[PDB]
Amino acid sequence: SNQALPSHYNYPNSLTLKNKYGITNHKDFTNKCAHDSAKAAINLRQEEPPKKFDSSYLKYLHKQLFKETFEWAGHTRDLPFTFADGTVGVMPEMIRSNWRTEQPIIFATGNKVQDGLKNIDKMLIEKNNLQGLSHKEFIENIAEIFACLNYTHPFREGNGRTQRIFCEKLAQAAGYYLDFSVVTKERMSEASITAAQDSNLEPMKKLFDDISNPIKTAVLKECINSLKNIDHKNINDCIIVAADKGLTYKGIYTDNSPDSIILKTDNIYIICSKNDLAPEQLKTLKLGDECTITVPMKQNIENTLIPKEKLPPLTKNAIIENIKKDTLIQAKLRQVTHLSKLVYGSSKILNNQLELINTNQKSGEQLSAQITSSPQSISKLAGIKIFGMKNSMRKKAEDNIIKLANSIKSYGSAVKNVETTMIQQHKSEQKRLSKTVKLPSTKLQNILNLPEEKSSIGKELTDFISSLNARLSPSERKMILESNHQQFAKNVGISESQAETIIKTAQKAKEVYQKMQKPAVDLTKHLIVSG
């Protein structure tokens, strides 16, 4: 039946679009089409941008992409197009269903396509191809243009890639560089769906901000490449965005990128640079927990090679756990539990009481006394006393009560001493961490960077190395020597790129300090130990 139908855009009873190649299998046709499309896109990106951006340039892009593929390459879907085969194709109505909601998503219909294009051109005329405009104006306008192009769906197929190239060249003209590879399939689809359904352009605006701002682009690209899965899901099937400075994000720490952390909020993942968090937070953060992170306007605001850590003061329950870890307390505890088993019949009987001493309640000789005078108060003493009988267990327990009390007193004294020493060590670590290392001066940095190489600057270098030795722990300095960037970043609480920067500058400082010095005036060695 001679007529104009959408079905004529495909081969009969087939998803394969009519093409010049002649291939009918959909798999082979898709593979060939994408293979040629990649080359066409590369060559198009080589070309210089046009003076004006309009519908005609988009048609040129589409034609150059699909010239070898589609007899209708370069022709809008709304315009009825005759095939050389004699058929006539039209696409007045286009719909797609978000699978999440199974709700209709309607593209432009009929001549509305043209209107959109016309409308677009008007904005691309008055707004001077989005040149000379602020960052925010450019983001808003390009988001509107891309969303209107997506809604228009001017070409039966291929409008996604042509839109990508058109926007890339337009931004290039505006001075920005766009990267869509850092855009997950889920994120792009969700932004497009919001725009098409609720006319929410804010997700699209954020997306274009992220792919136009190089720092956010680097953050997202780093996370995408390093991590191949998020929340047990493929990286593509996740909506991931970068954190914007000065805001707050309350989410769930789910994945640890080498230089970033990821927070989940309602299935949307936020990438927070480790370098935008204080070391105390990162040490405190534990994977799986709920967290609240605020993004600073500027890290290294006090430019420092190694940042400070404000060590939180010790918790009471943390004190209890630490003293439980201590091995002297463990030895005293095992002796006490042995005596408790002998006297009462089960160690656990006295455990509650032990816990009291841990919390500085009923502590010291309060329990010991209670053991000697009123052992029955805690529990029945080991053994039985029938008709006033004294079993062997009864005699043994009555003999061991005093040793139990003495062990308890020793345990309390040990707990007190251990707590005091623990507090002192924690304060010493706090003093070490409150130290800071200043960024090497520009001249010192230039010296350190130069490979060939060969006293005021020397004095600055010695001060820098002294700050290093003070701030760093011996273990961390060993990590410096062995170039253990991963564990160094773990210990000091920094991004691994920052950790590598620190390690390299420190190694250069050490070598330069060595080479500057040649003190052979005398070398005191082999001190006299015996006569």
Helix axes 392-434, 316-325, angle to 10 degrees: 120
What secondary structure letter does DSSP report for 272?
E
Q: How far is CA 219 from the centre of its chain?
A: 8
- Does 240-297 carry CATH code 2.40.50.140? yes
Are 105 and 95 a contacting pair, CB within 8 Å? Answer: yes
Count of positions (residues) in the chain: 531
- Which residue type is seen at 166? F
Torsion region of 273: left, alpha or beta (phi above 0 gives left; psi -120 to 50 gives alpha): beta
Cα–Cα distance measured from residue 211 to residue 240, given in angstroms and rounded to the nearest whole number: 12
Are 243 and 273 a contacting pair, CB within 8 Å? Answer: yes
Method used to solve the structure: X-ray
- Does 3-239 carry CATH code 1.10.3290.10? yes
End-to-end CA distance of the chain: 119
Alpha helices in 175-313 (DSSP H): 185-198, 202-212, 214-226, 279-284
Give the DSSP H or E segment for 531: none
Reported in sequence order, the residue ranges of 387-485 that DSSP labels E, i.e. its strands, are 437-438
- Per the structure block, which two tokens stand in for 300? 């290294």
Looking at the DSSP assignment, which residues form a beta bridge with residue 106? 95
Select from 128, 216, 220, 214 the least CA-distant residue to 176: 214
Question: Resolution, in Å, please?
Answer: 3.0
Reported in sequence order, the residue ranges of 295-386 that DSSP labels E, i.e. its strands, are 304-306
Can you tell me whether residue 113 is helix, strand or coil? helix
Given this chain, do its domains 3-239 and 240-297 carry the same CATH topology?
Answer: no
Cα dist from 70 to 21, 73, 246, 277, whole Å: 8, 5, 49, 52
Indicate the burial class of 450 (C-beta count within 10 angstroms; 0-12, 13-18, 19 or more).
exposed
At a CB cut-off of 8 Å and minimum separation 6, what does 129 contact? 52, 53, 170, 173, 174
SS3 string, 473-508, reads CHHHHHHHHHCCHHHHHHHHCCCHHHHHHHHHHHHH
- Per the structure block, which two tokens stand in for 89? 């194709």
Cα dihedral sign, 211-42-30-71: positive
